[PDB]
């Protein structure tokens, strides 16, 4: 039932938010029932896949519904539900505390309610400050009415790993601007690093006192962003469409930006449709991996990837246990990481299979779109405006399972029968 409440509550926010976009106030142009359902699902799953341009199709009131759906969907459904109950004064019971444990994927119920106090207070604080930092740049270019709203929309969009942009070019006009680059890359790196990581970073100011998870995320993000920045710069250095007609200073900005955006924001500074096939392949591995076990990002998390990678290498070297940072890792941690990875690959395989039946599109665009939808990144090669009505319905199901997590979606409708009986061992050869 704790996975059932999350699944029901997440879907209802799509349906409730879809009606708010269908109103004539929300949009300038008529909006289809599937485009409104896609944009509602692309916001509460915090993906950023846009059938129609967000700035032009929607009015100010329509974009205010977007910010509400991004904020509610970015921090999780049960995160705001805790605040509502505490405000009204209802007691947070043990039954209500088990939902919060399931929502943050915590193994322990100790201090899980206090983390919601910490994480919501930090989230509203950082989105407010980052808007002020972006206010010094977006206000002289768009006035006070639009510049203040442009900075406020993007601070909520960037921190929650959304990638929605009001402008027709999603951050392609600010390739070389350090103010837009540094502040936004600060938001989705810190917003996707993990809520428990940020709590562990602030309360202990020394690296030796960090938990194993906190040390994994700080080292894992730094290692992965370094390899990704080196790969995009080397592969796309001589490409004419992207990173070719740019200065060496602006080459390093777009290479830095395109390396951190697939995990899992979905902003861009170069056109992904003109990238080489070699760089797109590495982006798929990049955006199949997420960032942070409990954050605003999705996909299989970085700690899941490190656990499986280190467990395989330990086996290949003959070691009998998985050791990261001089810490052994138990069998329940390994099996949950492989259950996430195998379930995610099967669902991505179903999404790629079902789209090739439906869409008449190049294969690399279909593969790039399904990893982007399941990982809730939102990067495109030019397929989302070209989807059919049946093709869009597949992406909505993919984005739903991708944000909610493959395991929690399965636990909703999978019977949990406990049998204490055991069986004799059978030998099978698994070469």
């Amino acid at each position: 039932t704790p996975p059932q409440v999350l699944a029901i509550g997440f879907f209802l926010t799509i349906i409730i938010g879809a009606v708010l976009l269908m109103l004539p106030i929300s949009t300038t142009k008529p909006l289809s029932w599937i485009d409104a359902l896609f944009t509602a699902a692309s916001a509460t799953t915090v993906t950023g896949l846009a059938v129609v341009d967000t700035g032009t199709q929607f009015t100010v009131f329509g974009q205010t519904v977007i910010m509400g759906l991004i904020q509610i969907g970015g921090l999780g459904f049960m995160t705001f539900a805790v605040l509502i109950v505490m405000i009204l004064g209802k007691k947070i019971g043990l039954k209500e505390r088990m939902l919060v444990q399931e929502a943050l994927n915590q193994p322990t119920i100790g201090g899980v309610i206090g983390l919601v106090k910490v994480l919501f207070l930090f989230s509203i604080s950082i989105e407010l400050i980052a808007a002020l930092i972006l206010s010094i740049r977006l206000v002289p270019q768009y006035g006070w009415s639009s510049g203040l709203f442009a900075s406020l929309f993007h601070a909520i969009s960037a921190f929650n790993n959304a990638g929605f942009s009001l402008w027709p070019d999603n951050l392609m006009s600010y390739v070389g601007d350090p103010t837009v680059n540094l502040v936004i890359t600060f938001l989705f790196i810190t917003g996707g690093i993990g809520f428990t990581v940020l709590f562990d970073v602030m309360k202990n100011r020394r690296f030796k006192t960090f938990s194993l998870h906190t040390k994994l995320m700080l080292t894992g993000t730094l290692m992965l962003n370094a390899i990704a920045m080196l790969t995009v710069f080397i592969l796309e250095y001589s490409n004419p469409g992207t990173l070719g007609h740019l200065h060496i200073v602006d080459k390093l900005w777009a290479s830095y930006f395109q390396a951190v955006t697939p995990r899992t924001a979905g902003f861009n500074s170069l056109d992904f449709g003109s990238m080489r096939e070699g760089t797109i392949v590495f982006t798929l591995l990049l955006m199949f991996i997420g960032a942070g076990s409990a954050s605003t990002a999705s996909g299989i998390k970085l700690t899941t990837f490190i656990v499986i990678l280190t467990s395989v290498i330990a086996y290949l070297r003959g070691k009998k246990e998985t050791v990261i940072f001089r810490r052994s890792i138990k069998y329940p941690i390994i099996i949950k990481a492989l259950a996430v990875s195998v379930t995610s690959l099967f669902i991505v395989f179903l999404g790629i299979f079902a789209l090739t039946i439906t869409e008449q599109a190049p294969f690399l665009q279909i593969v790039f779109e399904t990893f982007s939808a399941f990982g809730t990144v939102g990067l495109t090669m030019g397929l989302t405006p070209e989807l059919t009505t049946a093709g869009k319905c597949i992406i909505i199901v993919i984005m739903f399972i991708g944000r909610i997590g493959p395991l929690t979606f399965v636990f909703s409708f999978a019977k949990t029968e406990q049998s204490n009986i055991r069986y004799p061992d059978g030998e099978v050869f698994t070469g």
């Binding site: 049998s419 204490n420 009986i421 055991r422 069986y423 004799p424």
Partner: protein
């Protein structure tokens, strides 16, 4: 027919191997992991389960078995708790292996359909062969008449059946001869012993 044998000891392990040899569906339950692994090949279904728990007993589909044999005869607590559960699950035929006279009396109260003493029935059968070495095997039709498979001595060599007056003098009916040759006989318990002494 489907049979369940609970407890794979020397007794229960024999019933699993014999019923599997005849071509029957046998469920072999034992709390010991190494016992089930050995008898896994000799049973249609083998489970490492504790049968004193009702939750584990319902997991096996034990209500689908007409005959359940509880071959636990050294743990009275495990044997009596098991056959109380199976009587609750409305098993038509529960056959229990007992340990002593008091274990027989508990299982008779709590509804065992047949209670078996394998070592006590064999020990009395062995001690009858020890006391009189002429006998080899017997079956008690009643408390006073038996079909004793006697062994022919040296004085019975080269003696015809018509020479023997077992029909009238001893009142014993010879049934078969298995060529000292095995001599199957039937008569009163006191009457057969006369033929053994006088050849």
């Amino acid at each position: 027919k489907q049979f369940a044998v609970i407890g794979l000891g020397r007794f229960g392990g024999s019933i699993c191997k014999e019923l599997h040899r005849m071509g029957h569906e046998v469920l072999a339950v034992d709390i010991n992991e190494e016992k089930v692994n050995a008898y896994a090949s000799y049973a249609t279904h083998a489970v490492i389960a504790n049968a004193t728990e009702e939750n584990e007993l319902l997991s096996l589909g034990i209500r689908n078995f007409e005959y359940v044999i509880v071959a636990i005869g050294a743990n009275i607590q495990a044997s009596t708790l098991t056959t109380l559960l199976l009587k609750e699950l409305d098993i038509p035929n529960i056959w229990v292996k007992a340990q002593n006279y008091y274990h027989h009396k508990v299982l008779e109260k709590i509804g065992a359909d047949r209670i078996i003493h394998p070592e006590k029935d064999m020990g009395v059968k062995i001690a009858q062969s020890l006391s009189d070495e002429n006998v080899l095997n017997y079956i008690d039709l009643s408390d006073e008449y038996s079909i004793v498979e006697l062994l022919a001595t040296r004085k019975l060599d080269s003696k015809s059946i018509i020479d023997l007056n077992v029909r009238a003098k001893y009142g014993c009916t010879i049934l078969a001869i298995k060529h000292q040759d095995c001599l199957v006989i039937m008569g009163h318990k006191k009457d057969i012993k006369r033929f053994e002494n006088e050849g």
